[PDB]
Amino acid sequence: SQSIIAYTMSLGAENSVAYSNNSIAIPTNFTISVTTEILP
Amino acid sequence: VTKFNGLTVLPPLLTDEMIAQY
């Protein structure tokens, strides 16, 4: 059932931004995200 | 913009289409 497949890679999910001259998006909820970074 | 005697020229992972999509 499970096997190695060959396919064209995806660079990200498609998301078309609905542009409008009388509309804006303002966030109402925030999430404090903690990310790591490792450098020698 | 500006061989076959053991010199293997491999193509990169992201071609000119994937850079244009980025």
Coordinates of N, CA, C and O in Angstrom, one line a residue:
Chain A
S1 N 0.8 -1.2 0.0 CA 0.0 0.0 0.0 C 0.9 1.3 0.0 O 0.7 2.1 -0.9
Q2 N 1.8 1.3 1.0 CA 2.7 2.5 1.1 C 3.9 2.3 0.2 O 4.6 1.2 0.4
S3 N 4.2 3.2 -0.6 CA 5.4 3.2 -1.4 C 5.9 4.6 -1.7 O 5.2 5.6 -1.5
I4 N 7.1 4.6 -2.3 CA 7.7 5.9 -2.6 C 7.1 6.4 -3.9 O 7.2 5.7 -4.9
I5 N 6.6 7.6 -3.9 CA 5.9 8.2 -5.1 C 6.8 9.3 -5.6 O 7.6 9.9 -5.0
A6 N 6.5 9.7 -6.9 CA 7.1 10.8 -7.6 C 6.1 11.8 -7.9 O 5.0 11.5 -8.5
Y7 N 6.3 13.1 -7.6 CA 5.3 14.1 -7.8 C 6.0 15.5 -7.9 O 7.2 15.6 -7.4
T8 N 5.4 16.4 -8.5 CA 5.9 17.8 -8.5 C 5.7 18.4 -7.2 O 4.6 18.3 -6.6
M9 N 6.7 19.1 -6.7 CA 6.7 19.6 -5.3 C 5.8 20.9 -5.3 O 5.6 21.6 -6.2
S10 N 5.2 21.1 -4.1 CA 4.4 22.2 -3.8 C 5.1 23.2 -2.9 O 5.7 22.9 -1.9
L11 N 5.1 24.5 -3.4 CA 5.8 25.6 -2.6 C 5.0 26.2 -1.6 O 5.4 27.2 -0.9
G12 N 3.7 25.8 -1.4 CA 2.9 26.3 -0.4 C 1.4 26.2 -0.8 O 1.1 25.9 -1.9
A13 N 0.6 26.5 0.2 CA -0.9 26.4 0.0 C -1.4 27.6 -0.8 O -0.9 28.7 -0.5
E14 N -2.3 27.4 -1.7 CA -2.9 28.5 -2.5 C -3.8 29.3 -1.6 O -4.7 28.8 -1.0
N15 N -3.7 30.6 -1.6 CA -4.5 31.5 -0.9 C -4.6 32.9 -1.6 O -3.6 33.7 -1.5
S16 N -5.7 33.1 -2.3 CA -5.8 34.3 -3.1 C -6.3 35.4 -2.1 O -7.4 35.3 -1.5
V17 N -5.6 36.5 -2.0 CA -6.0 37.6 -1.2 C -7.0 38.5 -1.9 O -6.7 39.0 -3.0
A18 N -8.2 38.6 -1.3 CA -9.3 39.4 -1.9 C -9.0 40.9 -1.7 O -9.3 41.4 -0.7
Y19 N -8.4 41.5 -2.7 CA -8.1 42.9 -2.7 C -9.3 43.8 -2.8 O -10.2 43.5 -3.6
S20 N -9.4 44.9 -2.0 CA -10.5 45.8 -2.0 C -10.1 47.1 -1.6 O -9.2 47.2 -0.7
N21 N -10.6 48.2 -2.2 CA -10.3 49.6 -1.8 C -11.1 50.1 -0.6 O -10.8 51.2 -0.2
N22 N -12.0 49.3 -0.1 CA -12.8 49.7 1.1 C -12.9 48.5 2.1 O -14.0 48.3 2.6
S23 N -11.8 47.8 2.3 CA -11.8 46.7 3.2 C -10.4 46.5 3.7 O -9.4 46.6 3.0
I24 N -10.3 46.3 5.0 CA -9.0 46.1 5.7 C -9.2 44.9 6.8 O -10.3 44.7 7.2
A25 N -8.1 44.3 7.1 CA -8.1 43.2 8.1 C -7.3 43.6 9.3 O -6.2 44.0 9.2
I26 N -8.0 43.6 10.5 CA -7.4 43.9 11.7 C -7.5 42.7 12.7 O -8.5 42.1 12.8
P27 N -6.3 42.3 13.2 CA -6.4 41.1 14.1 C -7.1 41.4 15.5 O -6.9 42.5 16.0
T28 N -7.8 40.4 16.0 CA -8.4 40.5 17.3 C -7.9 39.6 18.3 O -8.1 39.8 19.5
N29 N -7.1 38.6 17.9 CA -6.5 37.6 18.9 C -5.1 37.4 18.5 O -4.7 37.4 17.3
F30 N -4.2 37.3 19.5 CA -2.8 37.2 19.3 C -2.3 35.9 20.1 O -2.8 35.6 21.1
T31 N -1.3 35.3 19.5 CA -0.7 34.1 20.1 C 0.8 34.3 20.2 O 1.5 34.6 19.2
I32 N 1.3 34.3 21.4 CA 2.7 34.5 21.7 C 3.5 33.3 21.3 O 3.5 32.3 22.0
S33 N 4.1 33.3 20.1 CA 4.8 32.1 19.6 C 6.3 32.2 20.0 O 6.9 33.3 19.9
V34 N 6.9 31.1 20.4 CA 8.3 31.0 20.8 C 9.0 30.1 19.8 O 8.7 28.9 19.7
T35 N 9.9 30.7 19.0 CA 10.7 29.9 18.1 C 12.1 29.8 18.5 O 12.6 30.7 19.2
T36 N 12.8 28.8 18.0 CA 14.2 28.6 18.3 C 15.1 28.9 17.1 O 14.7 28.9 16.0
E37 N 16.4 29.1 17.4 CA 17.4 29.4 16.4 C 18.7 28.9 16.9 O 19.2 29.2 18.0
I38 N 19.4 28.0 16.1 CA 20.6 27.4 16.4 C 21.7 27.8 15.4 O 21.5 27.5 14.2
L39 N 22.7 28.4 15.9 CA 23.9 28.8 15.1 C 25.2 28.5 15.7 O 25.3 28.6 17.0
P40 N 26.1 28.0 15.0 CA 27.4 27.6 15.6 C 28.3 28.8 15.9 O 28.2 29.9 15.3
Chain B
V1 N 22.3 36.9 -20.3 CA 23.3 36.1 -19.4 C 24.3 35.5 -20.3 O 24.2 35.4 -21.5
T2 N 25.5 35.2 -19.7 CA 26.6 34.6 -20.5 C 26.7 33.1 -20.2 O 26.2 32.3 -21.0
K3 N 33.8 18.5 -20.4 CA 32.4 18.7 -20.0 C 31.8 17.3 -19.7 O 31.1 17.1 -18.7
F4 N 32.0 16.3 -20.6 CA 31.5 15.0 -20.5 C 32.6 14.0 -20.3 O 32.6 12.9 -20.8
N5 N 33.7 14.4 -19.5 CA 34.8 13.5 -19.2 C 34.9 13.3 -17.7 O 36.0 13.3 -17.1
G6 N 33.7 13.0 -17.1 CA 33.7 12.8 -15.6 C 33.2 13.9 -14.8 O 33.1 13.8 -13.6
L7 N 32.8 15.0 -15.5 CA 32.2 16.2 -14.8 C 30.7 16.1 -14.9 O 30.1 16.4 -15.9
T8 N 30.1 15.8 -13.8 CA 28.6 15.6 -13.7 C 28.0 16.9 -13.2 O 28.2 17.3 -12.1
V9 N 27.3 17.6 -14.2 CA 26.7 18.9 -13.8 C 25.2 18.6 -13.5 O 24.4 18.3 -14.4
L10 N 24.9 18.6 -12.2 CA 23.6 18.3 -11.7 C 22.7 19.5 -11.7 O 23.1 20.6 -11.3
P11 N 21.4 19.4 -12.1 CA 20.5 20.5 -12.0 C 20.1 20.7 -10.5 O 20.1 19.8 -9.7
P12 N 19.7 22.0 -10.2 CA 19.3 22.2 -8.8 C 17.9 21.7 -8.5 O 17.2 21.3 -9.4
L13 N 17.5 21.8 -7.2 CA 16.2 21.4 -6.8 C 15.1 22.3 -7.3 O 14.1 21.9 -7.8
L14 N 15.4 23.6 -7.2 CA 14.4 24.6 -7.6 C 14.9 25.2 -9.0 O 15.9 25.8 -9.1
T15 N 14.1 24.9 -10.0 CA 14.4 25.4 -11.4 C 13.9 26.8 -11.5 O 13.5 27.5 -10.6
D16 N 13.9 27.3 -12.8 CA 13.5 28.7 -13.0 C 12.0 28.9 -12.9 O 11.5 30.0 -12.7
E17 N 11.2 27.8 -12.9 CA 9.8 27.9 -12.7 C 9.5 28.1 -11.2 O 8.6 28.9 -10.8
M18 N 10.2 27.4 -10.3 CA 10.0 27.5 -8.9 C 10.5 28.8 -8.3 O 9.9 29.3 -7.3
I19 N 11.5 29.4 -8.9 CA 11.9 30.7 -8.5 C 10.9 31.8 -8.9 O 10.6 32.7 -8.2
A20 N 10.3 31.6 -10.1 CA 9.3 32.5 -10.6 C 8.0 32.3 -9.8 O 7.2 33.3 -9.6
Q21 N 7.7 31.2 -9.2 CA 6.6 31.0 -8.3 C 6.9 31.6 -7.0 O 5.9 32.1 -6.3
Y22 N 8.1 31.6 -6.5 CA 8.5 32.3 -5.3 C 8.5 33.8 -5.5 O 8.2 34.6 -4.6

